[PDB]
Amino acid sequence: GENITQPTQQSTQATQRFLIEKFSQEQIGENIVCRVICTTGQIPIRDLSADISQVLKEKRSIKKVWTFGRNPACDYHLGNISRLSNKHFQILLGEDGNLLLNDISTNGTWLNGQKVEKNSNQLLSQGDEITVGVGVESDILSLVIFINDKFKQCLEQNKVDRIR
């Protein structure tokens, strides 16, 4: 008895069960540039995506950037806090198809426990993470980006060459 069949009278509902279905509903991210997951809780898992076709052409089509802060949802739509919360950081996509991270914060942006320069694009890293609001162990906020290897696999399958 692993599957479900012939349910007996026990509990009926069409609300809470629906939420569970969506959770299990796994979506494919082959064109989905990358997914950002804020573990600290500052920002909710937001899916970052881009057009693969743009990468194939490059130059002409390759300009997409995600922003976290006071926006209707640039990258994410969040409240308006004069300190850390507003346009607190950004993610850049492009440069030979690769991905870049732009740390935009008011006074301090961190990378894996290493304070960095503001509005400073960064080379994408596997499971990279940006920390913000440093000073007190109890007042630090973290940001993590989960890149889909599927996207990288596609680029490899479509290498550049002109040999007959």
Curated annotation (Swiss-Prot):
Record domain FHA: where: 66-116
Modified residues (Phosphoserine): S24
Note in the entry: Present with 6900 molecules/cell in log phase SD medium.
Source species of the chain: Saccharomyces cerevisiae (strain ATCC 204508 / S288c) (Baker's yeast)
UniProt-annotated location(s): Nucleus
Encoding gene per record: RAD53
Protein name: Serine/threonine-protein kinase RAD53
Family note: Belongs to the protein kinase superfamily. CAMK Ser/Thr protein kinase family. CHEK2 subfamily.
Domain comment as written in the entry: FHA domains are phosphothreonine recognition modules, FHA 1 strongly selects for Asp at position +3 relative to phosphothreonine, whereas FHA 2 selects for Ile in this position.
Assembly with partners or alone: Interacts (via domain FHA 1) with PTC2 (when phosphorylated); the interaction is direct and serves to regulate DNA damage checkpoint signaling. Interacts with PIN4.
Role: Controls S-phase checkpoint as well as G1 and G2 DNA damage checkpoints. Phosphorylates proteins on serine, threonine, and tyrosine. Prevents entry into anaphase and mitotic exit after DNA damage via regulation of the Polo kinase CDC5. Seems to be involved in the phosphorylation of RPH1.
Modification after translation, per record: Autophosphorylated. Phosphorylated in response to DNA double-strand breaks; dephosphorylation is mediated by PTC2 and PTC3.
Part of the whole protein covered: 1 to 164 of 821
